[PDB]
Symmetry: D2
């Protein structure tokens, strides 16, 4: 289902394991930004979705600090999984960077992304 | 810093532990919506912030299924921690519900919130 | 550039004129939600863009009251125009409904949309 | 009601006239950003709100080009007006700047603001 290797249009990649648990654990690699190599991810999802043909709700977080680099920032993704012969995940995202109290009005970016398996 | 008990002015509350490894682990109790009791939370944060006076970036997720009910929905929170005499967490949030293909245009709310400690 | 007729893949459509004075003026017809017929639109855009290959920034608003019905709600669209052989407008949107003080936490949806011309 | 002079916590100011019309027209001055002096604004609002004690829906747009400066960007505000002895307007905002197709993933900021009269 959700478990496996997914891609986006920018060329970023992410690998996940989805547990019975309702938990999401894995790594993310960004093709853009002040980022190099792989980063740790964690999240949650609805493990008992409805039957009516609606999608499956989920979300996950990434902080941009690893052994090579630290951007002093973090992104969260919110969306849903749609299954079938051509599975996808549709999301919207927020990225916050640390700032002074003075610069806080410009700390946060918003965008959206589709991943496919 | 972050480790402790926090609240927002809706009356919602959460408890968290921040580790040296960059994780966030705890549980959340909502005062509004289709929810009762405690729900699992997980996330990440910047464990080595700049020292120029800027805040510490973080995020976390909750999915609204526990032993008592399932709302078929999830929320993510994005923002930063600001410490000192009056420590706060300032965030923006996204809530997504599972909808059919036709109704996806109205599946996601956006909002903001300030939490205060102790 | 912008002046003309545009659509999104929900089937919604709008007509607009962009003036030398920086205004946007037209009307919008929605294919979904609590809406029938045409609604008034107004906005602004960058009338003197950079020439490095970047897009042209703009925005517009619609309030969902006309002669036939009133939904007690409004939407704003924020984004940019990209011209050439295949011209597009790429946006993100906010829809706010009038709620009581208690329900304000769930008054606003967020979404995105790409429009295509002619 | 909505007509008059409003302020925010940053020290930005805006003056509006709200017509029978359902229209919003005025100017905005920013205390932050790549901005100097006053800018033209336009928008719409619900001129026949419900009676139940819910607020009044509205929105407005600003492009950051005037006779002194041009930032190549625009902000839109979405929210509602709440009347009484202590009137306010509560909103959320999006700011887009022009970018290349390559840099589009970071074109848009999001935040929120309360104004009082
Ligand atoms: O520059 C930073 O602050 C760190 C890299 C940010 C990467 C972002 S997260 C949203 C978007 N989607 C991606 O795959 N990468 C960028
Ligand atoms: O109704 C649901 O779908 C689940 C409960 C949602 C609770 C929300 S999350 C945003 C807001 N902030 C809170 O503390 N509670 C509500
Ligand atoms: O139902 C309402 O409150 C008024 C109609 C809303 C229509 C929305 S605006 C976002 C989305 N894009 C469209 O073209 N139509 C819907
Ligand atoms: O720097 C720019 O691109 C132009 C100035 C941006 C001003 C923004 S709009 C959101 C926020 N609220 C304000 O009063 N000012 C800033």
């Amino acid at each position: 289902g959700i478990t496996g290797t997914w891609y986006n249009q920018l060329g970023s990649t992410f690998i996940v394991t989805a547990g019975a648990d309702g938990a999401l654990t894995g790594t993310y690699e960004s093709a853009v930004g002040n980022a190099e190599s792989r980063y740790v991810l964690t999240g949650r999802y609805d493990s008992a979705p409805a039957t009516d043909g609606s999608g499956t709700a989920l979300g996950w977080t990434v902080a941009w600090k690893n052994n090579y680099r630290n951007a002093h920032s973090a992104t969260t993704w919110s969306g849903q999984y749609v299954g079938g012969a051509e599975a996808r995940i549709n999301t919207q995202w927020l990225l916050t960077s640390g700032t002074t109290e003075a610069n806080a009005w410009k700390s946060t970016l918003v965008g959206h992304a589709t991943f496919t398996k």
